[PDB]
Design a protein around this ligand. Sequence first.
Ligand SMILES: [Cl-]
Ligand SMILES: [Cu+2]
Ligand SMILES: [Zn+2]
Length: 105
Amino acid sequence: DKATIPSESPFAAAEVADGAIVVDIAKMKYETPELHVKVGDTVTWINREAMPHNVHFVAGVLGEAALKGPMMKKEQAYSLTFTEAGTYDYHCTPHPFLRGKVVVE
Ligand SMILES: [Cl-]
Ligand SMILES: [Cu+2]
Ligand SMILES: [Zn+2]
């Protein structure tokens, strides 16, 4: 697989450090739609609104199985560590037009 999961379930956003790599979700947008990171970087998504959101990498992107992240409520967060160089599209399961990309160098 091309990523690992620090926490299988969402956790409180308050636990994320200032300066951690963070993608906010708000107004139906991933606030960094094309994120550039390095191999071994841990990316954390944080939902800032009441509409629940997840991240969903389809089969073939991070492995042979889809990675369907858990739904995050407001002020919940979810992380992935990218372990292999590449480019990875993802979207929100319920809202396929809310989508983004992680570029791992
Ligand atoms: Cl499926
Ligand atoms: Cu969503
Ligand atoms: Zn909905």
